[PDB]
Design a protein around this ligand. Structure first.
Ligand SMILES: O=C(N[C@@H]1C[C@H](c2nnn[nH]2)c2ccccc21)c1cccc(F)c1
Length: 263
């Protein structure tokens, strides 16, 4: 069946020039709204949530892991590294790398998380261990953002990512202190005000992780605490036909607004 909310999302998509994927979980009743919910989309930097969560999981059996120093060398810098470049020829702890990856979208920090997990397949292995059979990470930064249409590498579906984000932030995939740390990091994101947040009432509290890539790929995944309501989990993925297409964060805001008006 096609719901009123799904028809509004289809109209938004038709006027956007691209392909839109949405998954909402409303934890008030566990109901879900999906739009292209089982189609694959390139995750881009939204995958940084899975990598940070995997390191948090490791830290449950290594109390000092998040304080372990990691060498940052000049060769480790990639294309966008606003935090890591200040520490070249020095060190950052895994907590510092996680915070930089999540809150500033630092790509060198992401690569250190991936290396701590043994490579992209270690992030995928963590996803499988928490019940996500869909997520796949295949490459490091920056090439995981190529976002080529039809390419399965570094993709997931909106339904899978929403379920996983719920388990990580509101469920019990992580220990309680680790879940709280992940939520704190997401709530402190610096990059998200133009994306899902821009479509929601301003009184609501949001933690989110954005992503952007080639093909105008514009993504956001969020946990939302509405005024007077149980939390929502919302994934909005968007990608366009031309490699050099511009970012469209307004499309993600519009999708979130449609979702919020449909509650
Ligand atoms: O790594 C890339 N962009 C990051 C992704 C990161 C961000 N965007 N939205 N959330 N995080 C960000 C922020 C500022 C500047 C660059 C970047 C990329 C994109 C296309 C092609 C490519 F080979 C790499």
């Amino acid at each position: 069946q096609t719901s009123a909310v799904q028809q509004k999302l289809a109209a938004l998509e038709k006027s956007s020039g691209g392909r839109l994927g949405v998954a909402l979980i409303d934890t008030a009743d566990n109901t879900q709204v999906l739009y292209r919910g089982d189609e694959r989309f390139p995750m881009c930097s939204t995958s940084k949530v899975m990598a940070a969560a995997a390191v948090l999981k490791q830290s449950e059996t290594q109390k000092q892991l998040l304080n372990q120093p990691v060498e940052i060398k000049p060769a480790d810098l990639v294309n966008y590294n606003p935090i890591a470049e200040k520490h070249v020829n020095g060190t950052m702890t895994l907590a510092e790398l996680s915070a930089a990856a999540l809150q500033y979208s630092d790509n060198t920090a992401m690569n250190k998380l991936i290396a701590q997990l043994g490579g992209p397949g270690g992030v995928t292995a963590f996803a499988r261990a928490i019940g996500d059979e869909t997520f796949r990470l295949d490459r490091t930064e920056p090439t995981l953002n190529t976002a080529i249409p039809g390419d399965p590498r570094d993709t997931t579906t909106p339904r899978a990512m929403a379920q996983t984000l719920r388990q990580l932030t509101l469920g019990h995939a992580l220990g309680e202190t680790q879940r709280a740390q992940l939520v704190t990091w997401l709530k402190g994101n610096t990059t998200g005000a133009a994306s899902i947040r821009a479509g929601l009432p301003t009184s609501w509290t949001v933690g989110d992780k954005t992503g952007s890539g080639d093909y105008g790929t514009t993504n956001d995944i969020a946990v939302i605490w509405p005024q007077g309501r149980a939390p929502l989990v919302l994934v909005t993925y968007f990608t366009q036909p031309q490699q050099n297409a511009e970012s469209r964060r307004d499309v993600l805001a519009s999708a979130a607004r449609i979702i919020a008006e449909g509650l």
